[PDB]
Amino acid sequence: TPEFGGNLQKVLVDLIELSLQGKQAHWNVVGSNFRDLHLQLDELVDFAREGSDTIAERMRALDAVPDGRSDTVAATTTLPEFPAFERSTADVVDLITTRINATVDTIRRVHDAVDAEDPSTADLLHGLIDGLEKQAWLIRSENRKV
Amino acid sequence: TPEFGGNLQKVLVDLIELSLQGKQAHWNVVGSNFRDLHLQLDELVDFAREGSDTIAERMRALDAVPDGRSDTVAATTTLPEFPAFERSTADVVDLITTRINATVDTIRRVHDAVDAEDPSTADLLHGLIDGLEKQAWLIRSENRKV
Amino acid sequence: TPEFGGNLQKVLVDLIELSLQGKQAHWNVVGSNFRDLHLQLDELVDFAREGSDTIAERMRALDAVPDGRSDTVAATTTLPEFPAFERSTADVVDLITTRINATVDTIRRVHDAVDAEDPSTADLLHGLIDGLEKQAWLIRSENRKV
Amino acid sequence: TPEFGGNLQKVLVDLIELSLQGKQAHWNVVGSNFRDLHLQLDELVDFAREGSDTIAERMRALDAVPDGRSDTVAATTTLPEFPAFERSTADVVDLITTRINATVDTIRRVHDAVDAEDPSTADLLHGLIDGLEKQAWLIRSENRKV
Amino acid sequence: TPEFGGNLQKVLVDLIELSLQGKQAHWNVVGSNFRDLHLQLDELVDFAREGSDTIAERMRALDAVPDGRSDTVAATTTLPEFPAFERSTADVVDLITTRINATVDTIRRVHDAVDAEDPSTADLLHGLIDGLEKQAWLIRSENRKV
Amino acid sequence: TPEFGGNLQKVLVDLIELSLQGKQAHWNVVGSNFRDLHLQLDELVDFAREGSDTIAERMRALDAVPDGRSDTVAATTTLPEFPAFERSTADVVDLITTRINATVDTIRRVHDAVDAEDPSTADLLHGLIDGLEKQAWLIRSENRKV
Amino acid sequence: PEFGGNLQKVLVDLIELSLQGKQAHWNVVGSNFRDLHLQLDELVDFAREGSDTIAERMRALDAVPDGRSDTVAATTTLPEFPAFERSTADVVDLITTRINATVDTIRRVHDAVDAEDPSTADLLHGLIDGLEKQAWLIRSENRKV
Amino acid sequence: TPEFGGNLQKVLVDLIELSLQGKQAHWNVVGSNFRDLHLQLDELVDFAREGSDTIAERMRALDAVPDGRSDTVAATTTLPEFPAFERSTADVVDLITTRINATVDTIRRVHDAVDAEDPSTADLLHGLIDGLEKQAWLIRSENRKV
Amino acid sequence: TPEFGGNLQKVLVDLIELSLQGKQAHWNVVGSNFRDLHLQLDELVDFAREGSDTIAERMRALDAVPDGRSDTVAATTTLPEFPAFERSTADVVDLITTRINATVDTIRRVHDAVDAEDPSTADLLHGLIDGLEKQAWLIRSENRKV
Amino acid sequence: TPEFGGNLQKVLVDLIELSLQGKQAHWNVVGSNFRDLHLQLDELVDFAREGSDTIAERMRALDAVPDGRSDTVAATTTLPEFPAFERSTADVVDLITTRINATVDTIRRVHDAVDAEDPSTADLLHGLIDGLEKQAWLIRSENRKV
Amino acid sequence: TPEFGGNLQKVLVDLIELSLQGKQAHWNVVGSNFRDLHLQLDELVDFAREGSDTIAERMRALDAVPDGRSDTVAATTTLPEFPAFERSTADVVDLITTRINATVDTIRRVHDAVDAEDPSTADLLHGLIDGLEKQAWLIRSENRKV
Amino acid sequence: TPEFGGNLQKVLVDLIELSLQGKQAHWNVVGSNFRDLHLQLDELVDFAREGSDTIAERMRALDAVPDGRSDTVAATTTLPEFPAFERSTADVVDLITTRINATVDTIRRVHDAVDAEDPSTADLLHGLIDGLEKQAWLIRSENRKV
Structure with missing residues (x-):
């Protein structure tokens, strides 16, 4: 159905934007814990x-x-636009967390219609949510207060 | 130097556009001899x-x-924009060949300044132009009729 | 649960019959763009x-x-019986597409009944739909004209 | 969400107890088909x-x-406690079958709440049910007679 | 030649029947030494x-x-028709031994004509014979007593 | 001898407790320099x-x-118990170092009695010292101030 | 000595076939180009x-x-190969003809070589099997029905 | 030292005899748990x-x-000479257990002089004792009753 | 077929003796061009x-x-007995060549009787001739002078 | 341009002749230090x-x-023609060194025009010079006497 | 030529000194963000x-x-002499950055003569500059504050 | 203890010097068995x-x-100094044998105190002795007279 196609297209464009933003931050990050942030952004882009x-x-x-x-x-x-200069680690972690949260929340909106229409695609969305949430947790744990 | 940075930035944005549009063609292409194009476009995107x-x-x-x-x-x-909707294999081969030719032409134009400033980066440009030209040959040989 | 057992038996019989037809077509197919079909039918049989x-x-x-x-x-x-002699690539592609369509339609009918009892097996059926429909698209794209 | 955390904590604690008791059986099992039980219990602990x-x-x-x-x-x-000393093959198979049955029963009770709140976690629980039931079948098949 | 094609078709149909028999027994076998029989039947099906x-x-x-x-x-x-329901270890090993012996016997009768006509195919027949005989030994050696 | 068996059982209890506590820390750790601890505690648990x-x-x-x-x-x-809530990275490093030191010092007591009977087991105990001490240094170096 | 002569005739034919396959691998254009390109490389390796x-x-x-x-x-x-760009159908036909000649000479030598050394007869049987499989897998492209 | 050479020669000849014994039993064993014995004897021969x-x-x-x-x-x-004909499962397990016990006993007598002269070779002896005793456990644990 | 059994036993005895002599020479060989012989005799023993x-x-x-x-x-x-002391490389090459020649002579002698009954075993004999003669050529080319 | 095409064609024919030459030497060489040259010539042919x-x-x-x-x-x-029949290792090394040096001379002679025309191809020629010169040293240093 | 030999010898000794000093730093680095430096220094030593x-x-x-x-x-x-004892992470990062900069600067000085004499060796120098500069950036970005 | 640290430092500097001289001989050696020594010294440097x-x-x-x-x-x-010119293979083999002998002599000298203080470290020294002596034999067997 055209509605299903439009929802999947909105998910796909968000995923592509997230990948591009992840690569840009991967290239343009400086600060502490560089190796781990560098590797994690690459893993997130691959996923x-x-x-x-x-x-x-x-x-x-x-x-x-x-x-x-x-x-x-x-x-x-x-997804919100990303800064075009070198950024501190806290700022890039915060921005990546916000973008991942927005990407997850869009999929969580569309999940009801997707499950009502095609459980097979609902399963793929479930896997995507699982992966994105794991990535988001392991990144956001860097800037936690406690 | 800022001019060197801009010359490399043009190459970078051209490569990103090429990768995104190659993925688009990989997803969208239909017609005769589909599988060969489907695999080779994925290889092109990876490269x-x-x-x-x-x-x-x-x-x-x-x-x-x-x-x-x-x-x-x-x-x-x-690079010119990719046409929408489902396209025949001949048309997508022609469009991909033209776009890869444009990209390698950009590489050729920037190569003089790149070699004048940094031979190490000139070597990377040599490798990229070699790979892209090989991919272009393998694509355009599909549509050749002799 | 005799009804559950019978439904799963109906699923398994169709899967085995489809695998046998896929192998027979893999051995028998001949014509233009032969190699791509030869490999894809092997992949479908493995799946x-x-x-x-x-x-x-x-x-x-x-x-x-x-x-x-x-x-x-x-x-x-x-599933319908398969031709016993050498067939053109267009005809074998059409036959394989029809077979995949019938198989996925069978799972589609049994889906609600099996989900009424076991979400775990529902997940397996979702995965089978994903794989079979992907294969069906990749094969049917051979004969698409647009 | 605290109830969700409680159910997931019960799942985690049951899985940890199952792993520890499976390792106990792995080190302790003696009797016929010793190698078979040794390998299968190791696989169960890994899973x-x-x-x-x-x-x-x-x-x-x-x-x-x-x-x-x-x-x-x-x-x-x-899960009930494991025997303290060397046990026969039939006894250890029965004990492991009972433990896995209790674990999957607990998962089944948690399944309704997890499906109510987070389908992504529901999918993981479905996969866990699948794996544990497969292991339970492969183990209990040893003792079953005709 | 048509007779050569007929003998090769006989061998092919026998191997397909053997593969189906092995998979069915692999799924259905219950009793002692079950895990080893399960693995061996899968290996036989693969071969x-x-x-x-x-x-x-x-x-x-x-x-x-x-x-x-x-x-x-x-x-x-x-190959003679297989039991329909769950069978003990002795029955399944005996039955698999009988089917493998029948298959290798048919190949043995075909071998004379195959060696008369095409030694290249005769070599493949020899490889099938000794692989199947090795598998038959590993299977029937379970039931053998002193 | 029963004394040797009891000493080995006491060592095994400490190793299992250390593995469980390491997994607890791996799950519950949070704060600055996360990913390094997250990977390294997983490696320690595996070892x-x-x-x-x-x-x-x-x-x-x-x-x-x-x-x-x-x-x-x-x-x-x-080994004394682990805190039940989210802890800072410096604190979890300190606690893990303390646990590893206690575990290796237990081995240091038991080593003389083990070597008094079985040098072959003494070699395994030496290997355990090597691995655990390497891990202890690799963790403790996090908070070292020169 | 005759055994050595027959094996030398086999070896020169195999080397010529490898060179033919590499030439066609480099110089082929047309439809199904990627599939022919990979197949010819596999044949050259074999x-x-x-x-x-x-x-x-x-x-x-x-x-x-x-x-x-x-x-x-x-x-x-083996017959001489054209030195210019060739259509895919012509490349397939030429490769099929060369492979047929190569397996024909092997079949011709098979009787004497098997009568003298079964161990070498086995290797020649394997070569016949492989080259015939490649021959079918290529010639299937231009089959009429 | 000639005494050192003699002790190591006795070790080597015992190991070679054990390897030949294991391979012969691997070829010759017939009875229950056949596949497990076949795999384990091959592993022992390799070690x-x-x-x-x-x-x-x-x-x-x-x-x-x-x-x-x-x-x-x-x-x-x-090592005493092995039976010449087909042997039952219990008999072959007992024979292999006795052979391994004799080998490790010989190693234990030699280990005193080996540790007296060269600790580096004593380490290899300890490793051999460990591996052989583990294999002996996996063997003799088959025939043990409760 | 007691004659067939005796022939295969004679083959097996020769192969085992060859492997033992190969390991002995691999341990004992010394002199010019040592390493190549050291590796090739290990390969010969493996085969x-x-x-x-x-x-x-x-x-x-x-x-x-x-x-x-x-x-x-x-x-x-x-096969003739092997020297018990350190031997020159030329001597060990000659001895290995003689041993391999005797082994292949035995197989050639038994080949007609084997093929009189079982072409499948004749195929294994052909493979053994191929491998042993290849190894013999590599060994013999060391001492060749022209 | 046709002159550039011929310049690369000379390189191609020289490389093919060198490959056939290396294969001939690999098959034909006999004498002292066989295995080293036998493997080295295979590596040269692969390169x-x-x-x-x-x-x-x-x-x-x-x-x-x-x-x-x-x-x-x-x-x-x-490249000069290779004499037939079995040749001593020293003569084979000398001939291979001379032919590789001739090939490198041809590459160096064409390198000026190749670099003046296409740096991407100049890089490939640089890599070929590196590999061939390394092989030439690794072979010719066999015959060197200090 | 002796001048070319000396120019390459200076680069060789600089690389050896850099590798030894990198191992030294790998051994005596302590402080915050330890593991990332520990792995990166090992990677630098390998390169x-x-x-x-x-x-x-x-x-x-x-x-x-x-x-x-x-x-x-x-x-x-x-290269300047590396101070001994345990060093803080910031200091060791600064020291390694300075040393890699000195090495790449020396390579940059020698590059002109190397390219004037042998373009193949110029290519190797380009690759070394690329790798060393990448490592230097990845290390120095740790200490960067923006 | 400071004495323990000093002894370990004495061992470490000897190992580093041995690795450097091994690499020097790897680069510098010419003569007969060149490929053999080239591979062997590379293995020794890696170890x-x-x-x-x-x-x-x-x-x-x-x-x-x-x-x-x-x-x-x-x-x-x-360790004694290594010559800086091209050396015959016999001389370099003798020199490497002398260096390995000196290195193992140092470790054997320190072994008593190392075992008195830390059996785990004594085990590492035992392994080093084993490996270095194996390399020493595998090299010096080249130049043996008888």
Whole structure:
């Protein structure tokens, strides 16, 4: 259905934007605990790319047309823009946490309709939520107060 | 130097645009001889991602500031936009060949200044142009009729 | 739960019959773009065998009695018979697409009944839908004209 | 959410107790099919450890605090204690079957609440039920007669 | 030659029947020494599937048409029909021994004509014979007494 | 001898308690320099589990009876308990260092009695010292101030 | 000595086939290009392995190999290959014809080589199997029905 | 030292005899738990071969002359000769247990002089004792009753 | 087929004696070009062990009883005894060449009688000839002068 | 350009001739220190084949026509012919060194034009010079006497 | 030429000194963020060893005489002396950054003559500069504050 | 204790000097058996580096500080100097044998105090002696007269 296709397209553009932001932060981060932040951003980008590809193949299987162009992503993404200069570790961790939370929350919005329509795709969304939440936890644990 | 940083930034944004659009074509292509294009476009995307990461790390080592944001890519890329909807294999082969030719032409234009300033970065450009030209040959040989 | 056992037996019989047809077509197919089909049918057979074994072991865990005999498969399968001679690639692609469609439609009918009892087996069926539909798309894209 | 944390803590403590008791049986089992039981119990312990780690990371990523201390396990576990000395093969198979049945029963009680609140955790619990039931079948098949 | 194709088709259909028999027994076997029988039957199925695929590819290379449909298997198989329900260890090992012996006996009768016509295919037949005989030894040696 | 068996059982209890407490710390740790501790405590738990299994199998080979039940561990362990809530990274490093020091000092007491009978087991005890002391240094170096 | 001569004739044909496969691998264009490109590389690898196996076996049987380029050019029986870009159908046809000639000479030598040494007969049987499988797997592209 | 050479020669000849015994039993064993015995005897043969090679290379490094000839082994080894025909499971397990016990007893007598002269070789002896005793446990634990 | 069994026993005895002599030379060889011989004799022993195991399992599959005892191989082997002291590289090369020639001569002599009954075993004999003759060529080329 | 195409064609035919030459020497060489040269020539052949394939793919990418036919190689090669029959190792090393030096001389002669035209291809020639010179040293230092 | 040999010898001794000093720092680094520095210094040592070996093999191929003795390194190195004892992480990061900068600066000075004489060796120098600069950036970014 | 630390430092500097001279001989050796010595010395350098790192980690764990600087090695090492020119293979083999003998002599000298203070460290020294003596034999067997 066109509604299902549109929801999956909104998820896909958010995943692509998240991957691009992760790579940009991976390149442009400075500060403490550099090696771990560097490796974690790479792992997150790999996982996000794999999830985006899986969504693309599934949505193709359901006979929909994907929209993953750069202009389309820039026009329809929901993630906030990222700073273009070198950033401290606390700031980049905070920004990554916020972006991951927004990406997860969009999927949590669409989950009800996706489960009502196709449990097979609901399972892929469940796996994506699991992976993204694990990544978000392991990153956000750096800046915890206690 | 800022001009050197800008010359590398143009290459970086071109590679990111190429990778995203190659993934788009990988998801979207249908028609005769589908599987060969489906696999080779994935290989092209992998190579483009590796090259973009290599350029980002090298230019960071040379103390410059990357701009890999989606908005920046959309605003300052040189590759023409990818047409939407399902496309035939011949058309996608032609479009990918033209775009890879544009990218390698950009590499050729920047190569003079890059070699004049840093031979180490010139070597990375040589490797990238070699790989991209090999990919371009393997793609365009599909549509050749002799 | 005799109804659960019968439903899972109907699933397994169709999976085994489809695997046999896939192997026969893999051995028999010939024509334009032969190699891609030759490899993809092998991949589909491997996936079908993995799914059939997984279903059989799950249904064993639930204390049911599987029936995987050749006579039982031939007597209780739902998929149509396959041509016995050399077939063109377009025809074999169409036949394989029809077979995958019938198999996934069978799981679609049994889905609600099996989810009424066991969400765990529902998850396995979701995975089978994901894989089979991905294979169906990747094969049917061969004959698509647009 | 505190109730959710409580159910997940019960799951984690049951899994930890199962792993410890399985290692006990692994070191202690003597009798016929000794090598078979030795390998299978090691596989069961490995799977239980993987599942316990997955559950712990999931619930802690959902902002809960795990309690996997030995005193907590002893005080709040639900599995009955293991024999103290060398046991026959049939007896240890029966004991392990009973332990796995109790664990999966607890998971089944928790399943309703987890499906009510977080489908992502429900999916992990489904996978755990699948793995534990497969192991239980493979173990209990030793003692079953015709 | 048509007679050569007929003998190779007989061997192929026998191997397919053996693979189906092995998988069914693998799923269904219950009793003593169960884990080892479970692993050995899976190994036998893997070997039988590889041999059947090898014969199919060879006969296709020699310009013959294979017949691996389930209906054809049921109509032209030579292995006697297998029990329907759960069976003890002695019964299953004895039955598997009888089917393997029947298969190798059929291959033995075909071997004379195959060696008369094509020694290259005769070598593949020899490999199948001794692999199957090794598997038969490992299986029947369980029931043997002193 | 029963005294040797009791000493080995006491060592095994300490190893199991250390592994469980390490997993607790791995789950519950939070604060600055997270990922390093998160990976390193997992490595320590893996090594401790390997050592505990090896020592259990060795003591079984020497014809003794292991006691690895949760109640037995809680009743006869020597390592003091772990905090039940989220702790700072410096504190968890200090506690883990203390636990490892207690465990290795227990081995230091038991070593003379072990070597008085069995140099082969003394070698395994030496290996345990090597691994645990390397891990202890690798953890304690976090808070070292020169 | 005749045994050595037959094995030398086999070896030069295998080397020529490997060179033919590499040439077609580099110089092929048209439809199904990626599949033909991979298949020809696999065939070249198999031909090189078979040539090595024959060379080492015949060395073990105390003969003197002749695998020089001049010797191959003077003694091989495979037809000459075109030196320009060729369509895929023509490439498949030419490769099929060359493989058929190569397996034909092996079948011709098989009787004497098996009568003299079953161990070498086994290696030649394996080579026949592999090359015939490759021949079918390539020639299936241009089949009519 | 000639006495050192003689002790290590006795060790080597005993290891070679044990390897031959294990391989013969591996080929010849028939009865219950056949596949487990077949795998374990192969593992024991592999371990014995590795240990024999290690002892030979160590003794050669210490400027002695190894004697691994079959005639020397037959004339010098202390392990009693094996049955010549097919043997039952209990009998072969008992025979292997007795052979391993004799070998480790010989190693124990030699270990005193070995530790007196060269601790480096004493370490290898300890490793061999550990491995052989573990294998002996996995063997003799088969026939043990409660 | 007692004659067949005796022939296969003669093959097995020769292979075992060859492996033992190869290990002895591998331990004892010394002189110019030492390392190449040291590695190649190890490879020869590995191949001989593989061949001996293959022959033993094949003759077990043919319902025969092998005799691989040390006394049996010493009293039945045909290979000449090996020097017991340090030997020059040329001498050990000559001795190994002679031993391999005797071993392959035995197989060539028994080949006609073997093929008179079982072509599958004849195939294994062909493979053994191939491997042993390759090893013989590599050994003999060391001392060749031209 | 045709002159550049011919410049690379000379390199290609020289590499193919070198590969066949190395294979001939690998098969034919006998004498002292056999195994070292036997493995080294195989490594040389592998490197030459990889380099020839790389040059062929690059020159295809740059839209030229390879001529790798055996007749073309024989007619236009530059390496001296290899004498037949069995040759001593010293003569083989001398001839291989001379031919590799000739190939490196050809590469160096064409390198000026190649670098003036295409730096990407110049890099490939640099890599080939590195590899071939390393092989030349690793072979020629055999015959060196201080 | 002797000048080229000396220019390469200076780079070789600098690389050896850098590798030894990196190992020194790997051993005596303590403080906050220990593990990341501990791993990065090991990676740097591995890269330095690989580069030093590559330079040694290349300069050997070009018929020069290496001087990698400890006395020669101590006498002719250019890197400043590394202070002993345990050092804080900030200080060791600064020291390693300064040393890598000195090494790459020396390589930059020698690059002109190296490129003027042998472009192949210039390529190796380019690769070494790339790797060392990447490592230097990845280490120095730890201490950066923005 | 300071004496323990000093002895471990004496061992470490000897290992580092041995590794450096091994690399020098690896680069510098020419003559017969060149490939054999080239591989063997590379293996010895790898082993020496691993052993030196292991000693550094252990003595760090025991709260001591290493001195592995180039100046410290040159001032404190006990190994004789290595020639700086091209040497015959016999001479380099003799020199390496002498160096290994000196290195193992130092460790055997310190072994008494090391065992009196820490059996675990004595075990590491035993392993180092075993490895170094094996390498020493495997090298010096080249130049043996008889």
